Amino acid sequence: GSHMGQEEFAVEISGTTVTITCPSSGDDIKWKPDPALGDNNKYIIQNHDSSPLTVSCTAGDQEHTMYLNAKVGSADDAKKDAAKKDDAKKDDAKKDGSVAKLGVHGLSMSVKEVSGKVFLQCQESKDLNTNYLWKKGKEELGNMRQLDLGAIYDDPRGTYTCQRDENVNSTLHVHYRM
SS3 for 107-143, per residue? CCCCEEEECCEEEECCCCCCCCCCCCCCEECCCCCCC
Round to whole Å and give the CA distance between 73 and 107.
31
* CB 117, CB 152: distance < 8 Å: yes
Neighbours of 125 (CB within 10 A): 10
Distances, alpha carbon 80 to alpha carbons 2, 16, 17, in Å? 20, 12, 12
> Distance from first CA to last CA of the chain, Å, rounded?
28
A 10 A CB-CB count for 142 gives: 12
Amino acid at 79: K
Nearest to 61 by CA among 88, 10, 26: 26
Distances (CA, A) of 73 to 8, 13, 24, 51, 55: 23, 8, 27, 13, 20
CB atoms under 10 Å from CB of 64, counted, come to 25
Beta pairing partners, 157 = none
Q: How was this structure determined?
A: NMR
Contact predicate 147/110, CB 8 Å: no
- Burial of 172 (C-beta count, 10 Å sphere; 0-12/13-18/19+): buried
Whole-Å CA distances, 84 to 27, 43, 152 = 33, 22, 37
Q: How many residues does the chain have?
A: 178
* Phi, psi values for residue 14, rounded to 5°: -140, 95
Neighbours of 49 (CB within 10 A): 13
Task: Name the residue among 43, 46, 34, 53 with its Cα closest to residue 5.
Answer: 43
| List of residues 6+ apart from 153 with CB closer than 8 A | 116
Helix (H, G, I), strand (E, B), or coil: what is residue 24? Answer: coil
Helix (H) or strand (E) holding 44: strand 42-46
Residues 109, 146, 52, 163, CA torsion sign:
negative
Radius of gyration of the chain (CA): 17
Contact predicate 98/34, CB 8 Å = no
CA distance 19 to 85: 16
DSSP H or E segment with residue 57: strand 54-59
SS3 state at 146: coil
